[PDB]
């Protein structure tokens, strides 16, 4: 009731109370690879045969605390092993770098796209790298 808090509260409710249209759901940038389901990341890393470990999902990353440090997951992911998973940000940065450096020129990117789209329902078709 002081001509500042009024519009403050007004903006708050005008920004948090809407009709939840699916047309307003906040969508992430295409270049930020951390917002990619962590199975896209693993399939990318596994397809281009990169050299990274797998990531810690979110349950394995909050599982790290003095109390959480006694669970089988911590003691299987933090001792001396080779399967030692990592934080999603690291794998996502490796993937992003191999994305911005390895490059492509069309004349083979498009016809492959068309052959892919026109055969979605087919089980027996050209695997474009496998």
């Amino acid at each position: 009731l002081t001509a500042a808090q009024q519009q403050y509260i007004k903006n708050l409710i005008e920004t948090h109370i809407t009709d939840n249209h699916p047309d307003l759901r906040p969508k992430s940038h295409p270049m930020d690879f951390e917002e990619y389901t962590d199975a896209f990341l693993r399939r990318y890393k596994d397809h281009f045969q990169l050299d990274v470990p797998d990531n810690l999902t979110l349950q394995g990353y909050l599982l790290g605390s003095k109390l959480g440090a006694k669970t089988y997951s911590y003691k299987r992911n933090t001792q001396g092993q080779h399967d030692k998973r990592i934080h999603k940000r690291d794998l996502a940065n490796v993937v992003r770098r191999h994305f911005d450096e390895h490059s492509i020129k069309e004349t083979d990117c498009i016809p492959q796209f068309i052959y892919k789209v026109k055969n979605q329902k087919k089980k027996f078709k050209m695997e474009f790298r496998g």
Partner: protein, 393 residues
Amino acid sequence: VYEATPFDPITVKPSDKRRVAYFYDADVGNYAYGAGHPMKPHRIRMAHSLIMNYGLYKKMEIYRAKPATKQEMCQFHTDEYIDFLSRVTPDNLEMFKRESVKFNVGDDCPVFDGLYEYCSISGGGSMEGAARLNRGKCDVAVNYAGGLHHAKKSEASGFCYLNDIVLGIIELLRYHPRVLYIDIDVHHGDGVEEAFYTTDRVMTCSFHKYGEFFPGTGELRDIGVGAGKNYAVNVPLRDGIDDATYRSVFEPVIKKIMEWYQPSAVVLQCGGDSLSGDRLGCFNLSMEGHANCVNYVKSFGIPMMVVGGGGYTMRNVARTWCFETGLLNNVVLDKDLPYNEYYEYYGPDYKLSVRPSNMFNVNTPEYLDKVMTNIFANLENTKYAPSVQLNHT
């Protein structure tokens, strides 16, 4: 075709044992319709407590089932209805004043925080119970968060917003020819009956109170249209019916249905507004009288899917659900409740009992004889043709 008898001690038979899969989700109790509404999910949580503290969890397997998805809801409901459910909140209701008017929303079925999540939990539990029953894992599958049997394919009706039993029976029908549904609420199971009215693969059987009541449907002469004629059984009853009366009406109807319809997957709604002391129902059933139904439907030996329903006095639903669940495990419990976090709500003597009153029974040997004879007559056009080899159901 009805002789009244005394009510015999409920007792588990040792020749058959089950593999109970119990479904619970620690979130469900956390939703509330509003200030004074008679619907309280908290009671499901309360029942869980007794199951834990009686030592009953040690003979069954307790699972959280994943919530049901929008496109699993639209197997029975419309897109506009489900989209409304997903987008409406107690804060933006002013921008849905048409849809709220159009989908039967606002006084008997309000919108609370967590409506869509509560519906997801109910539907998920029901469909996962059905799927696990199809895969030959469990024999009985219990889901007390589901049984919202009053919901319409395009409308909210009677404290219910999503018909999870329809989804459950749709999943049960992928592998089964013939499914029976029993509804022992005090209201008529009208959503499920309206949904499966013109088919012969689901037989609905309601035992309700017909009068100046809710919803207003389910007469003795409402028996199915089309190819579904004679595949909808109604038993209308009057106030005051008690354990002996109810048992003598309930057993022969169900036994004749089992002999004729030969179904081989039963769904059982175990609503609790049909108990003495409830705040909306008007029967005079005990806890043993309400549990002998479960015991009888179990004594047959075909895949059962038990669900919740009504019950508006929390204490009594909690106690009768815990007792029924003990009976499905071949266990007659003890009457003294163990200490639990709800060691209130159970005044005044803290026991495993539901007590009947002395109110008067308005149902007499001629009304019931007439009703049951009409039913036994309607219920002989529903057999299987003589050349049709079965799988011993």
